[PDB]
């Protein structure tokens, strides 16, 4: 009916803070085609889906969030099976 209010008011350019690069994440890329991104605690799944969908220009299957014991949201982004993960891994600078 009305304008679609995003669940909170955030500014999208600050929500995806960084790729998390460790031995763990890289094989999630290899096996799952799933990126690992530390994001703003206040950020949701719909926000993250639009953000990556527009930013890197890839259609994203499903998102899974997490909250560290340190209070920092962490997101598994599993892309579709059409777009290969390692594509975006080279495009970003995460080397498998």
């Amino acid at each position: 009916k009305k304008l679609k209010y995003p669940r909170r008011i955030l500014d999208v350019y600050q929500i995806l803070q960084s790729p998390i690069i460790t031995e763990a994440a890289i094989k999630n890329i290899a096996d799952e085609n799933s990126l690992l991104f530390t994001v703003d605690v206040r950020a949701d799944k719909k926000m993250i889906r639009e953000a990556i969908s527009n930013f890197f220009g890839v259609k994203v299957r499903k998102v899974n969030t997490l909250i560290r014991p340190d209070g920092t949201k962490k997101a598994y982004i599993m892309l579709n099976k059409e777009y290969n993960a390692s594509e975006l891994a080279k495009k970003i600078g995460i080397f498998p």
Binding site: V12, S18, P19, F55
Partner: protein, 101 residues
């Protein structure tokens, strides 16, 4: 001398142009934050330069709004509005250079 120049350049633009410009900047800031983590060599000075650029822009924007006659409440309302209508677009800086490549 970059500061005075950049500010004279800022106060001569229009509102829409400022908005757009701001968005573009924040995006470039994103791509920068990506490079940091990738440990690809880059310039530590750049975060400062860019962030503060954005600042100066916003400041100018608000300073105009005050001449128009708008209050703090009205300000914050129209700001929530603008932040709701924001769509992410890929940063013209470096994402357009991986679209082309």
């Amino acid at each position: 001398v970059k500061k005075e120049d950049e500010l004279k350049e800022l106060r001569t633009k229009t509102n829409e142009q400022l908005n757009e410009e701001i968005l573009q900047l924040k995006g470039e800031l994103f791509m920068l934050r990506l490079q940091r983590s990738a440990r690809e060599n880059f310039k530590p000075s750049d975060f400062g330069r860019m962030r503060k650029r954005v600042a100066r822009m916003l400041t100018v924007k608000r300073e105009r709004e005050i001449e128009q006659g708008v209050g703090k409440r009205l300000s914050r309302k129209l700001d929530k509005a603008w932040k709701r209508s924001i769509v992410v677009r890929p940063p013209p800086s470096l994402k357009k250079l991986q679209e082309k490549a």
